[PDB]
Amino acid sequence: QELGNANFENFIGATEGFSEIAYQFTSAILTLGYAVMLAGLLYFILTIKNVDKKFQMSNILSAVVMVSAFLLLYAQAQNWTSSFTFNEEVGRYFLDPSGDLFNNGYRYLNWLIDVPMLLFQILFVVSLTTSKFSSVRNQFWFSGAMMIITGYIGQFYEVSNLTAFLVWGAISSAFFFHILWVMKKVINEGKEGISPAGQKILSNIWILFLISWTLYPGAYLMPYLTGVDGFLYSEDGVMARQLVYTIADVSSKVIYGVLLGNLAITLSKNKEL
Amino acid sequence: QELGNANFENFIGATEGFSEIAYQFTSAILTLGYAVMLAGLLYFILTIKNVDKKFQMSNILSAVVMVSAFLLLYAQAQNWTSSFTFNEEVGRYFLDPSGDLFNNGYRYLNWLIDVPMLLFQILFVVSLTTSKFSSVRNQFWFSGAMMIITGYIGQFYEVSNLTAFLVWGAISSAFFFHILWVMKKVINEGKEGISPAGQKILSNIWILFLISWTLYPGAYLMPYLTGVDGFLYSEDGVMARQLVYTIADVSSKVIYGVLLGNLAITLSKNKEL
Amino acid sequence: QELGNANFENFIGATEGFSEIAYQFTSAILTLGYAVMLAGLLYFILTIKNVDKKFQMSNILSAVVMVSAFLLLYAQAQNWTSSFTFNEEVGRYFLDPSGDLFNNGYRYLNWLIDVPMLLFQILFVVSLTTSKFSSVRNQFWFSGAMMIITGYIGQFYEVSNLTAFLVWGAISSAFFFHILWVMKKVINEGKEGISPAGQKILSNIWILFLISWTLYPGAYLMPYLTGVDGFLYSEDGVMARQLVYTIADVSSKVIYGVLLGNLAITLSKNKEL
Amino acid sequence: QELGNANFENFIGATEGFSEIAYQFTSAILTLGYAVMLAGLLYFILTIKNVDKKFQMSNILSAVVMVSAFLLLYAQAQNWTSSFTFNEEVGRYFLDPSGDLFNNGYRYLNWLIDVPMLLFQILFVVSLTTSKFSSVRNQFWFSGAMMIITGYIGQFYEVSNLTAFLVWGAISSAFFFHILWVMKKVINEGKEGISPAGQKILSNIWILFLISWTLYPGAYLMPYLTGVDGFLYSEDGVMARQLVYTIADVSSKVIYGVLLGNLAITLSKNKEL
Amino acid sequence: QELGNANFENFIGATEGFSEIAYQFTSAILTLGYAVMLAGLLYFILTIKNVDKKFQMSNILSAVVMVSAFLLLYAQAQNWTSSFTFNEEVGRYFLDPSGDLFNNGYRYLNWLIDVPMLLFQILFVVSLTTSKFSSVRNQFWFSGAMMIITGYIGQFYEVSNLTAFLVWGAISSAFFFHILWVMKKVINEGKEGISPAGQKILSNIWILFLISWTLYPGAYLMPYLTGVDGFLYSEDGVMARQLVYTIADVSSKVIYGVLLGNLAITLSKNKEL
Ligand SMILES: CCCCCCCC/C=C\CCCCCCCC(=O)OC[C@H](O)CO
Ligand SMILES: CCCCCCCC/C=C\CCCCCCCC(=O)OC[C@H](O)CO
Ligand SMILES: *C/C=C(C)/C=C/C=C(C)/C=C/C1=C(C)CCCC1(C)C
Ligand SMILES: *C/C=C(C)/C=C/C=C(C)/C=C/C1=C(C)CCCC1(C)C
Ligand SMILES: *C/C=C(C)/C=C/C=C(C)/C=C/C1=C(C)CCCC1(C)C
Ligand SMILES: *C/C=C(C)/C=C/C=C(C)/C=C/C1=C(C)CCCC1(C)C
Ligand SMILES: *C/C=C(C)/C=C/C=C(C)/C=C/C1=C(C)CCCC1(C)C
Ligand SMILES: CCCCCCCCCCCCCCCCCCCC
Ligand SMILES: CCCCCCCCO[C@@H]1O[C@H](CO)[C@@H](O)[C@H](O)[C@H]1O
Ligand SMILES: CCCCCCCCO[C@@H]1O[C@H](CO)[C@@H](O)[C@H](O)[C@H]1O
Ligand SMILES: CCCCCCCCO[C@@H]1O[C@H](CO)[C@@H](O)[C@H](O)[C@H]1O
Ligand SMILES: CCCCCCCCO[C@@H]1O[C@H](CO)[C@@H](O)[C@H](O)[C@H]1O
Ligand SMILES: CCCCCCCCO[C@@H]1O[C@H](CO)[C@@H](O)[C@H](O)[C@H]1O
Ligand code: NA
Ligand code: NA
Ligand code: NA
Ligand code: NA
Ligand code: NA
């Protein structure tokens, strides 16, 4: 079967197919994904007035990200169930091309909302010291866009051309490291002149940010993290990838948003935790 | 026909099929389910300002659970009608694998929202005495997650491997008992220093919690509660399971939420009930 | 063919089929139904602040019923168009079992929201004199539930077993009469110590309640109201049943809610009609 | 082919089929339709507080009509694309009876919301002089209902029985003329004792009302406005009908609502235009 | 294969078909499109109170455009995936006429909302000096309508009749130039008597407006921008067209709306950036 520049899910699905557990788990984990985002949307809107006016733009940008993540994860949850269909004879779910091939790239282009807005929103909670708002924003948005576009191109070749996959992935990684560098500066400057309570929260936000964002390139490589014909080049790797995405999605978007809201509360004059 | 690690609904549906009453009832009871959750969402939002600011987070977390439960019960209602199709010759609804096998596991992963948030929200209404907020929260969330994940694994084997089904179910039960233990403490400490009216409501909340949460392991075992080849290993057991889920869903989420809101009103300075 | 315990719509649809007028009218009347409920939801939310705080729970419960009625009528509108498909050869719409059989029972289980909440909400507008709030509520909810459950069982046999249909219907009717009895008391006690304007509205509410609620058992019997092989055991009876439901739905839920809102305004200190 | 009492769209679609332009335009014009109504819903809600409390009911009734028109135009937009399917051999869209026949009657029953509420809402902005509120309302609602029901019956026969089509249309027209008569009185009485600004707006509202409402009987007759085998008994007439509906829908509902809101602002003590 | 007056996407799709990258990218870029508009809707509503009352109509009109753009881009995203289906034998997505032909004209009719409202909303932020509000509005709306209708007609012939395509496009362009002329005046007059900060924002708005609006005629011509049998008369041109639309949509609607909101804040007495 000719699949071309398609994600490895389609190759596993076309050859071995997916067990009940693999198929039902991947559907459920994506469903949890979009459910968390819509619940988060409600949470971020309803808690707007829990912080001083100046901090409320962070609640609004969290809500903006929730809308993006909900729409994408909802669409992708339906894409999963449309792309793989039960074969009665063998009792496994095989590629159903009438549904279209499954593509993780769907996520990447919506990151053009998520990444820029997640990086931007912290600049409405913390105060910079030596760095300029417009400068940090421009660095975040440029490197964010380049990271996403290069990775988007790469993931199309994860089976068809491992070399292109790894080269584009490496270029994307360079921009990622730049973002990590700039966010560390923002966290450091953010800690300057705020309560120890606020500083603790920013320490947690940095760890959360570092781990949650690194999970995305982890998901990128997932099928090959056990090498050629490894344990993960299987339905187990398919499950692992969507699980990692969902953990990353909840952590990078919702928990990040909640911690920023808690920081905003400590920095708020009237409010306290 | 090879169904593998699938719920017993698919076996009944593939062999005997479902009568009009069994099929139509299961569809209607799931439809009532998601209708209650969306109505509950509206109720919890519209009554936010009926309690003092400090208590409003409980309304918000109720709303969060309503969103999760609505999305899941809506999706599962469609899953039911897609998985079983009318056979004109015999006049019963049989497994339609083109719709996918039906899986109750869909519910379990969304409990990673419901369970943590339901257990958390009471800590925004009652005041603890001897117990520490962070400690109760961490115990609820850890044991909640472990209870859900172990049960999720178990239910895949409810037909294919009764031993795995019962062992995973037993491990899950251990974590459940821990949750019951911690919640009893929270209720007791919550009663200390509040009006007799508030204490009565917490007594009711404990009974509701105990019964409603115990229904879930009841739903887990449903097909085997009348032993091998029992009355319940049938379309009658299929009906019973979804009925028990719906009673549990309405009770554990909505009625629990309403009682907590009523408690918040008694604890509120301005409000009287 | 073998339809078993199915509503008469499926028998007419399987034997005679439906004319363009019968099929298109039934679809349109259900569409009007769900449109009225969603419009009503908007109305009840937007007019919350038109009455004193104490009366606003009635607006909220109206909104809750609108959500239930919208979801059900929307789902049932789609169920109608899925269950009957055009036959080009004869130019009529015949039963399409791939869509499932059509079941009015879908409505009944959602009444477990509508009936309890419609009966409850008046107790937030009128003041009782001799009767106790908790007692009236408990009688409404018990008899409401029993009325619904017994009728739900009955309607499955409306073709397959006329005896069961009529016996279950009669038992259901007994609980209905109890509800009528209790509501009459509530209306009388509500009239005590309020303006003549408020008393006139409660008189209207009683007439509306009596007629609108009686339409439901009317819909139950519809196919047999012209006896065996009567005018109504036909596509004309199918049209009549859904028309009666829609009139009953609009009257019992929306107009009832509007009149209660108008009563709340007269009873409100600041507000005036 | 046997189509029975069906609209002429189905006859054109079954015999000639629709060109790319005819099919794509009819889909797009209905899509614009429902888009305008949902945008209008947002506008009428967001501008509620731009007028004195007493006038806000008019914003609410505008919103109610937006919900009705959105739901109907959305459903009808999907009905269009389901009822006509591309034939590769000839390159035109032909009747696809599996989707159901297309029926304009779908619109008519939703007018039982639109007509009564559009006629009602002006009575919350203007003050009557010689006429009684309840009397004008009752005349509007009775004649409105009769106009709709008689026309609804008529449109089923627009091909199958031209005589019935014209007779029912004529009866409907009589009730329409009554509505025009009553609305002219309302406008005249509304002009009495208000600013020149308010009087100008009521003059505009009358012209808008007269033209926009007359478009509906225009749409009714559309296929025959160029006589037997005329230019309009074609895909061009199909396009014209839905175009006229969309112009009528936007004019009679949204622009009417906006002008009433502007009138409310001029009549408002605090507010200025 | 006879496609008639259809867009070039259908010809490429019917002859060469689309690679995984071409098909998946076009789906993702449209998905990003509608996601941005729904996120924008939330943003424009939530930031209404960030500007003085007089400026809030601009937030409302932004929201109005978001609803239109969301609905259209969502519908068009589904139209893309319905119109092209995977062929297992060659591994490309080919025209699936059962889904309907793909038409960009769908966008054009919704511009009857977007264009008039985008041009209107600036007149609620800037103050005119020489020019009259009603006059600028009328010129914008007339030329906007004529630009859209002439272009709408043109795009049907982009393959079937290049002459009609170019002539209608040229006529449309004339009206576009008129709009550019009037908007330049509005921006110049808007700069008069406001802070240098506000003037800088209007300079940005003019560049954004000029580039973003010019992208639409760019999308119109896209397939022929590399001449006959050029690089762009291919799946690469199909990708380019939808990419350009999405850049234009985000830029002309959301970024334009955000900049107007920022201008409104600078012009607001209480508020500051
Ligand atoms: C191929 C391997 C790629 C190598 C990895 C590259 C990582 C660093 C990239 C860019 C550094 C700075 C780029 C800045 C982009 C312009 C935004 C900006 O800095 O302007 C702010 C303005 O001055 C208002 O203060
Ligand atoms: C955050 C929670 C995620 C939980 C989800 C679990 C998914 C497991 C993912 C990665 C583990 C694999 C790490 C790779 C270490 C194995 C290295 C190896 O096996 O060798 C490579 C091979 O030999 C060279 O050819
Ligand atoms: C909620 C969305 C978020 C936080 C998105 C984050 C995305 C990344 C950190 C992506 C990084 C990548 C690399 C570093 C290399 C491979 C390609 C990417 C784009 C997955
Ligand atoms: C609204 C969601 C709620 C309250 C979820 C509750 C879930 C449980 C109490 C689950 C318990 C289980 C066991 C104790 C054993 C079998 C497996 C479970 C997970 C069903
Ligand atoms: C909006 C929902 C409402 C008001 C529901 C009302 C339902 C009833 C009054 C049902 C009554 C019935 C009988 C008295 C006999 C036959 C069975 C029932 C349930 C239809
Ligand atoms: C937004 C909905 C509106 C304003 C509906 C208006 C409907 C009419 C004015 C209908 C009139 C008709 C006639 C006068 C004759 C033919 C049948 C009708 C119902 C189309
Ligand atoms: C968000 C919607 C916007 C900004 C729409 C803008 C539309 C145009 C500027 C269209 C211009 C065209 C021409 C100048 C020639 C070809 C036809 C058109 C309509 C695409
Ligand atoms: C308090 C408000 C009172 C409202 C009274 C106004 C009456 C409007 C109700 C309309 C009912 C029309 C019934 C038509 C009967 C069907 C006949 C159709 C002819 C074939
Ligand atoms: C940095 C992590 C990337 C390590 C590269 C591992 C090389 C994977 O090797 C690939 O494995 C596939 C599935 O097992 C095989 O089908 C391919 O033939 C093979 O190229
Ligand atoms: C706590 C309740 C669990 C007790 C275990 C019950 C044993 C059920 O045993 C199983 O029953 C199935 C259906 O009856 C049969 O098809 C299986 O062959 C049998 O293993
Ligand atoms: C109180 C109202 C109940 C009246 C019961 C009427 C009995 C109807 O009798 C039924 O009529 C059907 C329709 O033709 C027939 O098909 C059935 O064979 C017949 O039993
Ligand atoms: C405008 C109100 C009067 C219209 C009456 C016009 C008579 C139309 O006449 C009809 O035209 C159809 C289409 O050409 C034909 O198919 C029918 O045979 C014919 O009866
Ligand atoms: C301003 C830009 C207008 C340039 C129009 C000239 C291009 C028209 O060239 C067209 O190319 C198509 C494929 O490329 C062919 O199928 C057509 O037959 C041919 O007319
Ligand atoms: Na599937
Ligand atoms: Na089904
Ligand atoms: Na149908
Ligand atoms: Na179609
Ligand atoms: Na497709």
Author numbering:
A (entry chain A), B (entry chain B), C (entry chain C), D (entry chain D), E (entry chain E): 3 to 275
Paper text:
To gather more details about long-distance interactions between the protein core and surface, we solved the structure of pentameric form of KR2-H30A at pH 8.0 at 2.2 Å. Overall, the structure of this mutant is nearly the same as that of the ground state of WT protein (RMSD 0.15 Å). The organization of their inner cytoplasmic, central, and extracellular parts is identical. Surprisingly, in contradiction to the earlier FTIR experiments, Na+ bound at the oligomerization interface of the WT protein is also present in H30A2. However, the region of H30 is altered. Particularly, H30 side chain is replaced by two additional water molecules (wB′ and wB″). Moreover, the H30A mutation leads to appearance of second alternative conformation of Y108, not identified in other structures of KR2 or its variants. It was shown that H30A is more selective to sodium and almost does not pump protons. As the only existing differences in the structures of the WT and the mutant occur near Q78, N81, Y108, H30′ and pIRC2, we suggest that this region is important for cation selectivity, which additionally supports the hypothesis that this region is a part of ion translocation pathway.
